[PDB]
C-alpha cells in the first residue's frame, strides 16, 4: 500500500493502455522515458494516487510530448508538446544506437574513408555517441548521434583495441541521413589484441586463491516488507528505482529509542558527466551525460550470485518500460546484503580494568550499469553508527584512440600505437534533506588558525568557524581541503540534550571539479560540475542539475537557473547537490580491462544523537 | 636464517647477559628501548650479524647510555654516554607512570587543592603525560612528567568522565620532587558517569544482529615461512616488529612473471603526534608523541579471535624486552588474514558478447595499541592489483576537560559540564623506496588547465605536468587537492615495454597538516607535521622524523636537520616521508566511547607493469 513501492508490471501495462486510449501512443510513438512521480509535499494527501511521467518520441518527425498519467484513476493529467530546439531533445533511444552503423555502411563517403585504410566495412563497429551542442547549425531541432569507428577482427574480438582514428561521422537518426563525414587523415590502426580472456594474453590462470566463504546461518539481519521497505539495525528506508537515475533511496530515518527520526527524504545520483580532454576534432565534442542522455537504469546488469554479489544476498528485480510501453524486468538488478566492517569501538582501560571491543557492519544497496565500454557500480552504505556513504566504482574498458607519433599532452599510451584520451567522471548527488524534519539549514565549517600572542601565549590554539548559508545566491560553494572545509546540515528547531541544533556533517573527497574552460559548451551544459556544493530551496519540478532534457540542449536550464530565484534556505525545506568525481589519466595497468577505481562522499552525525548511538551493540 | 626474522626470546636473553657481564645493567639501570638493527646496505651481505640497539636509563641520576651489542658474537660494539640537555631525554618508562600519582598523593599543595574541591585523594587518578619544552629553565636536563587529575568514583568507573580542571602538577621522576602545582581556579567536576558497559546507560542490548560467518574451508591463500616471511598472490614481504614503531614491513616485492621486483625496502609509521589546541595553561603544553616518547609497540594489545580479528586468522606473537632485559611475549599481537574486497574488474561487451567479472582481495596485517585513553589500530593492506594502502583507526575515549560557563572556541561540549579539547592526530609514514631497485626519483604531478584558443578551439583540453625533485632543499612539498596533486616514485633506469620509467603514485587524503603557530614549541619539535611530503637521501642513522630522543628535546631534530644537508635525490637511494592526520573537533557521538574514525594513504602502480597485473585471476 506504500506510495513509495516499486512500479509493477501491471502499472506499466496500465500506463500503456491509458496512453493508447487517449490517442497518445499510436504506432509511430516511442516511450523515451517513463517513471513514477514521488508524492507531493503533504502528510497523507491523496489516499492513493500513483502518477507516472512519460516522454513520448515520434519517429515520423512530429513534436514529442511530455505526459503525466494517473494510473490509479485511468486519466491523462497533462500532455504538452515540446519544442526541442528550445528546451532540449528527448533521451537517446536504444533502437537509435543500432541505426548508426547500418546507415554508415552504405554511405559512399564512409566507404571511401574505410577503403583508404584498407578496412573491411563488415569488420568496422561504430560506437554511437551523444552529440552535444557545437557549431553545426543544421543540427538544431534534429536528433543527431556521432559515430567513432573500431575494428573487430573476429566476432569475439575486443574492438576497443583497434580504434580507427582520424574519422568521425554525424547521423540524423530520425530522417536516417548521414549529415557529415570528417576525415582528418589516416592513422595506423593499432594491431595488438586486447582479449582479456585469451590464454595467450592471460597466461596460465592462478591456482593459488583459496575460497573465502561468507554465510549467514540464521539469515540476514534486515527485513524487506512491501517489496522494497528495509529495516536494518535501527535504519528505515524505501529502495526505489528509476530508469533515469537508477537506485533512489527514500525516507531514510533512524529509530532513536521510541522515535523514528528522519534524516534524508530522497537521495539519488541525479546526473553524471564524462567529459573528454583531447582537443583533436575527432573527439573534442565527446561528453557523456550517462544519466540525463542515456538513462543509466535502462542499462542495469543482472547481478550473478557469488560473482557480482557475495554473501547472503537479497535481490530486487525492478520493472521498467520498453519503447512501446511493455514492462521489462531487470532480473536481479539490485543486490542488498550486510557486511562485516571491522572494529566499531575499542578501549582497554588501565584504571578500570575493563577491556571492550565491538564490531561494525554496514548495509549495502548496489546496482551496476554498462554503457558502451564503461561499467559503473553504484553503492549506498548505511553503518551502525549513523554514517551514510555513497561510493561509485568505475571499471570496464577505457576509451581508446591512436597514440600520435611524437607524443601527446592529452592522451596516454597503453600499448604500441594505442592511446587513451584524458577524461573525467563527475557525479551529482541530489540530497533532499530532512534532518529531524524539513526545517533545515546548511553551515560551512572551516578550521581557523590562531596567531601566537595574548590569550594564546604558547601558539597552540586552533578553532573553527561556521557560516550559515541564508539564500540561494550565496549557496554555491567550493571545496577547501587545506582548511578542512565541511558542510553541516542542521535543524535549528530540533535540539539535542545539550541545547545544540541536531546535524549531519558532509565529508567530501575534495577531488578536482570540471577542468574545461569556463566558456566551453560542456562548462555551460554541465555548470553543476564546476562547483562542489549547491543548496536550493525544494521545488517539485527541480529534479536534475542539468534540467529535464539534456540531450543536444544548450545551457539555460538546471542549477544556475534555479539558484537565480535567490530563495530563503535558512531553516527551510532544502536540497543539497554535491559534485564529486574522478580525473582519469589512464595508466598502462588500466589496459586491456581496468581494475576498479572509486570515489564518493559520506555524511556523519554531528550532535544528532545525545551520545554514541551504538552503546547497545552486543559483544557476540 | 633470514636477517629480517623477528627477535626471539633467546636473543633478548643473550643481550641481557652481555650487558650484565659488561657492567652496563646494574640495579640502577633500566632498558628504555631495545630493538634489532636492520642490515646495512649491501647486495652481498652474507655473514650473519644480529645487532641490537639499547637505550639504558639510570634511576639514580647518572648519564644514560646508548649501547649496540652483537648477539651473534656476544660483544658490546659501542657504548656512548648521552648528554640529555643536548640531544633529548630517553623514552618514558612504564614504571614512571605510577610514580606521578604516588608522589602527588603526599604533596601538601596537591592535597590542599583536592581538599578545596572535596575530593578524596584515594579516588583521584593522575594521567602522567609528557612534558615537552616550554618556559621552565629548571627543567632542562631533568626528566619531567606533567600530571592531570581525574576522579574514579569506584574501581570500575571511567575516570575520563570526571576531569578535575584548573589543576596541573609537574614532577621530576628521577629526584622524586613535585616541582610545581598550579591551581588556576575551581571548576565543577562533571558528575555524569561514562560507563559504557552499565546497562543503565546502554539500555537493553540489541537482539537483531544475526551472525556473519567468514571461513576459509581450504585454509588461507598466503604462506608464512621462517616465522615472518609472507607470500601471497604474487606479493613477498617480511613482517617485522619494533617496540618503538610497531609493525614494520620489509622487502615488499611483487613477482612479475619470472622476476621478483622490489617496490618498498622498508615501510613504517615512524612517528605520530597528538597536539592539543586548548590555550588554557592547564593543557596548552599537551602534545603526545606516541611513537617517539611512549613507544607504541610496547603497548600492543593481545587480539582476540572472533572479536578483534574475524575470519581465518594467522597470528604473530612478537617478543620485546621489559625494563630489566627479560623477554616478554605479546601473545597474538599481530593479526594476518585475507579479505574479500568486492569487484576487481567487470565488463559486459555488446559487440563481443563476452561478460566478464572478477573479484578482488586484500591481505591485511594489523595490530592495535593503547596509550592511556586512546586506542589506535594500524592496518597495512596489499591488493591483487598492486595497490598498497595504510589505514589508521582511531578509537578509545576522548581526553576531557570541564566545559566553561559561557562556552569555548577551543573545546566541544559532550555532556553537562564536560568538555573535549580540540586536537589533531598526525602520523608520519617513512617509506624507504626501492622501485625496481634503489635508483629512484620523485616527481610532483599537477593537473594543468588549458585556455580556450588555438589548438583548443572547443575549450575542452586539459593536461598534467610533472616536476622532478632533484635536491633535498626542494623536496619539502605541500598538498594541493584543487589541482589533483600526487607524487610519483619512479626508477629512471628501469623502463616498461613502452620505454617509460616504471613508477608508483602516492595518493594522499589531503587532510590539514599541523595547525599550531609556526613559532610554537610544538611546530619546532614536530616540524615534520607542517608539510605533507618530504624526500631525503637514505642514511643508516636517519630513522625517525623527530630524531632519536624526542622526549623533552628543544626542537629542530629529525627531518629539518636531515633536509639541511641538501643531498642529490635525482636517481638515488631515497626515503619518502608522508605526513597525514585527523583533525578532531569532538562530537557528542564520540562520547562515552568513540566510534572508529580513519585516515591513511595509498600507492598505486603507474606504468610499473606492462599491462594489468590481474589478468590471470580466475573466475572461481
Ligand atoms: Cu576513466
Ligand atoms: Cu581525537
Ligand atoms: Na528538504
Ligand atoms: Na630507498
Give me the CATH number covering residue A24: 3.10.450.40
The structural domain count of chain A equals: 3
**B430 C-alpha vs ligand 2 centroid, how far in Å?**
22
Q: Which of A45, A62, A87 is the last residue of a domain?
A: A87
Q: Which residues of A touch B514 (CB under 8 A)?
A: none
Instruction: Return the HEC string of A357-374.
Output: EEEEEEEEEEEEEEECCE
Binary contact (B370, A348; C-beta < 8 A): yes
Q: Which chain A residues are within 8 Å of B593, Cβ to Cβ?
A: 345, 347, 356, 612, 615
Residue A385: closest CA among chain B residues belongs to which residue?
Answer: B595
Q: Which is catalytic among the residues A157, A290, A532, A590?
A: A290
Closest residue, chain B, to A606 (C-alpha)? B587
Q: Which residues pair with A89 in a beta bridge?
A: A551
Contact: B210, A204; criterion CB under 8 Å: no
Q: Strand A29-36's sheet: what is its strand order?
A: A29-36, A51-58, A65-70, A75-81
Contacts of B263 (CB under 8 A, 6+ apart): B252, B253, B254, B388, B434, B435, B504, B608
DSSP string over A275-301: EB---STTTTT-EEEIIIII-GGGGBP
The Cα–Cα gap between B267 and B249 comes to 5
A5 plus A127 within the same structural domain:
no
Q: Are residues B275 and B126 in the same domain?
A: no
Cβ of A615 within 8 Å of Cβ of B449? The answer is no
Shared domain check, A237 and A182: no
Residue positions counted in chain B: 620
Chain A contact set for B360 (CB, 8 A):
595-596
Distance (Å, whole) CA B379 – CA A343: 12
- The residue in chain A having the minimum alpha-carbon distance to the alpha carbon of residue B531 is A482
CB B180 within 8 A of CB B158: no
Q: Which of A134, A156, A339 sits opposite B354 (nearest CB)?
A: A156
Chain A, chain B: beta-carbon pairs less than 8 Å apart? 429
CA distance A205 to B614: 10
CA of residue A446 to ligand 3 center, whole Å: 24
Nearest to A588 among B422, B498, B583 (CB): B498
Contact flag B521-A377 (C-beta cutoff 8 Å): no
Task: Determine whether B423 is exposed, middle or buried from the number of CB atoms within 10 Å of its CB (0-12, 13-18, 19+).
Answer: buried
Enumerate residues preceding breaks in chain A (C to N > 2.5 Å).
none
Look up residue B263 and give its three cell numbers: 617496490
Q: Which residues contact A581 (CB under 8 A, 6 or more apart)?
A: A424, A425, A426, A427, A511, A512, A513, A529, A599
**Eight-class DSSP state of B39:** P
- Residue pair A50/A240 in contact (Cβ under 8 Å)? The answer is no
Contacts from B553-558 at CB under 8 Å and sequence distance 24+? B553/B87, B553/B88, B553/B89, B553/B133, B553/B525, B554/B133, B554/B524, B554/B525, B555/B133, B555/B521, B555/B524, B555/B525, B555/B527, B556/B524, B556/B527, B557/B88, B557/B525, B558/B271, B558/B527, B558/B528
**Shortest CA distance from A386: residue in chain B:** B589
CB-closest option in A357, A396, A455 to B304: A357
CATH of the domain at A497: 2.70.98.20
Say yes or no for a CB contact (<8 Å) between B310 and A359: yes
- Inter-CA distances, B202 with A184, A620, B168, B300, B417, Å: 72, 15, 33, 28, 21
Give kind and range of the element (H or E) at residue B560.
helix B559-563
Question: b/e per residue, A550-562, with b = 16+ CB within 10 A?
Answer: bbbbebebbbbeb
Within 8 A of A593 by CB-CB distance, chain B residues are 345, 347, 356, 612, 615
HSE (side-chain half, CA atoms, 13 Å) at B430: 26
**A463: which chain B residues are within 8 Å (Cβ-Cβ)?**
277, 409-410, 422
- The answer on A124 and A211 residing in a single domain is no
Q: What is chain B's alpha carbon radius of gyration, rounded to the nearest angstrom?
A: 26
Q: Which residues of A touch B452 (CB under 8 A)?
A: 517, 519-520
DSSP state of B527: G
CA distance to partner chain A, nearest, from residue B393 (Å): 9
Identify the CA nearest to A124 among candidates A106, A141, A136.
A106
| Cα A244 from Cα A480, distance rounded (Å) | 32
Positive/negative CA dihedral, B97, B100, B106, B111: negative
Provide the β-strand partners of residue B361.
Answer: B340
Spell out which residues of chain A touch residue B451, defining contact as CB-CB under 8 Å: 517
Q: Would you call A520 and B452 a contact, using CB atoms and an 8 Å cutoff?
A: yes
B167 and B219 together in one domain:
no
Q: B515 CA to middle of ligand 2, Å?
A: 14
C-alpha cell at B68: 649496540
Q: Which three-class secondary structure state does DSSP give residue A114?
A: helix
Q: Are residues A252 and A180 in the same domain?
A: no
Q: What share of chain B is helix, strand, coil (3-state, %, to 5)?
A: 15, 45, 45
Task: Indicate whether B322 and B371 sit together in one domain.
Answer: yes
For residue A381, the surrounding DSSP H or E stretch is strand A374-383
3-state helix, strand, coil split of chain A in percent (to 5) is 15, 45, 45
Known binding residue A536? Answer is no
Residues that place a CB less than 5 A from ion ligand 3:
A 432-433, 538, 573
B126 and B202 in a single domain? The answer is no
Ligand number with the minimum distance to the CA of A597:
1
- Is A290 labeled as catalytic in the residue annotation? yes
Assess whether the previous peptide bond of A592 is cis (omega < 30° from 0). yes
Chain A residue closest in CA terms to B500: A413
CA distance A351 to chain B (A): 7
Same domain, A119 and A204: no
Q: How far is B137 from chain A (nearest CA, A)?
A: 16
Method used to solve the structure: X-ray
C-alpha cell at A5: 513501492
Boundary residue ending a domain (A195, A217, A244): A195
C-alpha cell at position A402: 591512436
- Order of all β-strands in the sheet with B75-81: B29-36, B51-58, B65-70, B75-81
Q: Name the active-site residue from A33, A170, A276, A374.
A: A374
Tell the burial category of B526 from Cβ atoms under 10 Å away from its Cβ (0-12, 13-18, 19+): buried
**Which of B228, B239, B319 lies closest to B11 in space, CA to CA?**
B319
Please tell me whether residues B271 and B134 are part of one structural domain: no
Show which of B158, B174, B195 is a domain's final residue: B195
**Segments forming the whole domain that contains residue A188:** 94-195
Supply the DSSP symbol for B322.
-
Beta bridge partners of B168: B182
In a mutational test of the B interface, the residue from A589, A602, A606 whose CB has the highest number of chain B CBs within 10 Å is A589
Alpha-carbon gap, residue B584 to B587, rounded angstroms: 9
Contacts of B441 (CB under 8 A, 6+ apart): B468, B469, B470, B489, B490, B491, B492, B569, B570, B571, B572, B574
Closest alpha carbon to A555 in A68, A132, A11? A132
Q: Which residues of B touch A375 (CB under 8 A)?
A: 346-348
Question: A218 and B211: CB-CB below 8 Å?
Answer: yes
Number of the ligand closest to the Cα of B400: 2
As a whole number of Å, the CA-based R_g of chain A is 26
Cα of A49 vs centre of ligand 3, distance in Å, is 22
CA A57 / ligand 2 centre spacing (Å): 57
Task: Tell me: is residue A342 an annotated ligand-binding position.
Answer: no
- DSSP state at residue A312: S
Residues 6+ apart with CB under 8 A from B492: B439, B441, B501, B571
C-beta atoms of B210 and A197 within 8 A: no
Are A526 and A465 members of one domain? yes
SS3 call for B305: strand
Tell me how far apart the alpha carbons of residues B318 and B322 are, in angstroms, rounded to a whole number. Answer: 13
Residues A208 and A99 in one domain: no
Q: Does B460 carry a binding-site annotation?
A: no
Smallest Cβ–Cβ distance between A517 and the set B459, B496, B589 belongs to B459
How many helices (H) and strands (E) chain B has is answered by 7, 34
Q: Is B433 helix (H, G, I), strand (E, B) or coil?
A: strand
Contact B297, B245 (CB under 8 A): yes
The grid coordinates listed for A477 are 560553494
A242 among known catalytic residues: no
Amino acid at each position: 500500500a506504500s506510495p513509495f513501492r516499486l512500479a509493477s508490471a501491471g502499472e506499466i501495462s496500465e500506463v500503456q493502455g491509458i496512453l493508447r486510449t487517449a490517442g497518445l501512443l499510436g504506432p509511430e510513438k516511442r516511450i523515451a522515458y517513463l517513471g513514477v512521480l514521488d508524492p507531493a509535499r503533504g502528510a497523507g494527501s491523496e489516499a492513493e494516487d500513483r502518477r507516472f511521467r512519460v516522454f513520448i518520441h515520434d519517429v515520423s518527425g512530429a513534436r514529442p510530448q511530455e505526459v503525466t498519467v494517473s494510473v490509479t484513476n485511468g486519466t491523462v493529467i497533462s500532455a504538452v508538446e515540446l519544442d526541442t530546439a528550445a528546451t532540449g531533445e528527448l533521451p537517446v533511444l536504444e533502437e537509435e544506437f543500432e541505426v548508426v552503423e547500418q546507415l554508415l555502411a552504405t554511405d559512399e563517403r564512409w566507404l571511401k574513408a574505410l577503403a583508404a585504410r584498407n578496412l573491411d566495412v563488415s569488420k568496422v563497429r561504430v560506437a554511437p555517441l551523444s552529440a552535444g551542442v557545437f557549431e553545426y547549425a543544421e543540427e538544431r531541432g534534429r536528433r543527431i548521434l556521432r559515430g567513432l569507428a573500431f575494428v573487430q577482427d573476429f566476432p569475439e574480438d575486443s574492438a576497443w583495441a583497434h580504434p580507427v582514428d582520424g574519422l568521425v561521422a554525424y547521423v540524423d537518426v530520425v530522417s536516417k541521413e548521414v549529415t557529415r563525414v570528417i576525415d582528418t587523415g589516416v592513422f595506423p590502426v593499432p594491431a595488438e589484441h586486447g582479449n582479456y580472456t585469451d590464454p595467450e594474453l592471460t597466461g596460465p590462470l592462478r591456482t593459488t586463491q583459496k575460497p573465502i566463504s561468507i554465510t549467514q546461518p540464521e539469515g540476514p539481519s534486515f527485513t524487506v516488507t512491501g517489496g522494497n521497505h528495509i529495516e536494518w539495525e535501527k535504519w528505515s528506508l524505501d529502495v526505489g528505482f528509476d530508469v533515469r537515475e537508477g537506485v533512489v533511496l527514500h525516507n531514510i530515518a533512524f529509530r532513536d529509542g521510541d522515535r523514528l527520526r528522519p534524516i534524508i527524504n530522497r537521495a539519488s545520483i541525479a546526473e553524471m558527466v564524462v567529459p573528454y580532454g583531447d582537443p583533436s576534432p575527432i573527439r573534442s565534442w565527446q561528453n557523456y551525460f550517462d544519466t540525463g542522455e542515456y538513462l543509466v537504469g535502462q542499462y542495469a546488469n543482472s547481478l550473478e550470485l557469488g560473482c557480482d554479489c557475495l554473501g547472503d544476498i537479497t535481490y530486487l528485480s525492478p520493472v521498467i518500460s520498453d519503447a512501446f510501453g511493455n514492462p521489462r524486468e531487470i532480473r536481479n538488478g539490485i543486490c542488498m546484503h550486510e557486511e562485516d566492517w571491522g572494529i566499531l569501538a575499542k578501549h582497554s582501560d588501565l584504571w578500570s580494568g575493563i577491556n571492550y571491543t565491538r564490531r561494525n557492519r554496514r548495509m549495502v544497496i548496489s546496482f551496476f550499469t554498462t554503457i558502451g565500454n564503461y561499467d559503473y557500480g553504484f553503492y549506498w552504505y548505511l553503518y551502525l553508527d549513523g554514517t551514510i556513504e555513497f561510493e561509485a566504482k568505475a571499471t570496464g574498458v577505457v576509451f581508446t584512440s591512436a597514440f600520435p607519433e611524437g607524443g601527446s599532452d592529452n592522451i596516454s599510451q597503453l600499448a604500441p600505437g594505442l592511446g587513451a584520451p584524458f577524461h573525467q567522471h563527475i557525479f551529482s548527488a541530489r540530497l533532499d534533506m530532512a534532518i529531524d524534519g524539513f526545517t533545515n539549514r546548511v553551515e560551512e565549517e572551516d578550521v581557523v588558525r590562531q596567531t601566537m600572542g595574548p590569550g594564546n601565549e604558547r601558539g597552540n590554539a586552533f578553532s573553527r568557524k561556521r557560516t550559515v548559508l541564508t539564500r540561494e545566491s550565496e549557496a554555491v560553494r567550493e571545496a577547501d581541503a587545506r582548511t578542512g572545509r565541511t558542510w553541516i546540515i542542521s535543524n535549528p528547531e530540533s535540539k539535542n540534550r545539550l541545547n545544540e541544533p541536531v546535524g549531519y556533517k558532509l565529508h567530501a573527497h575534495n577531488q578536482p571539479t570540471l577542468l574545461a574552460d569556463p566558456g566551453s559548451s560542456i562548462a555551460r551544459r554541465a555548470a553543476f560540475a564546476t562547483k562542489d556544493l549547491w543548496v536550493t530551496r525544494y521545488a517539485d519540478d527541480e529534479r536534475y542539475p542539468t534540467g529535464d532534457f539534456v540531450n543536444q540542449h544548450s545551457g539555460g536550464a538546471g542549477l544556475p537557473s534555479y539558484i537565480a530565484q535567490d530563495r530563503d534556505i535558512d531553516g527551510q525545506d532544502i536540497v543539497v547537490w554535491h559534485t564529486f568525481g574522478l580525473t582519469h589519466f589512464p595508466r598502462v595497468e588500466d589496459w586491456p580491462i581496468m581494475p576498479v577505481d572509486t570515489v564518493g562522499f559520506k555524511l556523519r552525525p554531528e550532535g544528532f544523537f545525545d551520545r554514541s548511538p551504538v552503546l547497545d551493540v552486543p559483544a557476540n
